[PDB]
């Protein structure tokens, strides 16, 4: 959990994103939250990979907010 400004979440469900802008993931994956884009979407990334993109807030259980 290196960066103090990042947030932290766990995927609640599989998320199949429609485009390259969305980051798809599977239930139970940990996600590093980078920013909250609006009321419905985070941008995040998966630790130890190059996966990054947006996904709905309703698909993740938030441990710590991004700053």
């Amino acid at each position: 959990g290196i960066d103090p400004f990042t947030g932290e979440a766990i995927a609640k469900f599989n998320f199949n994103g429609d485009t390259q802008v969305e980051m798809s993931f599977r239930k139970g994956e940990r996600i590093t939250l980078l920013r909250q884009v609006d009321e419905n979407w985070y941008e995040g990334r998966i630790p130890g990979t190059s996966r990054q993109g947006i996904f709905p807030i309703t698909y993740v259980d938030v441990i710590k907010r991004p700053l």
Partner: peptide, 10 residues
């Protein structure tokens, strides 16, 4: 059940 996916950000 996974919730419906909302419209992307504006």
């Amino acid at each position: 059940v996974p919730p419906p996916v909302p419209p992307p950000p504006s």
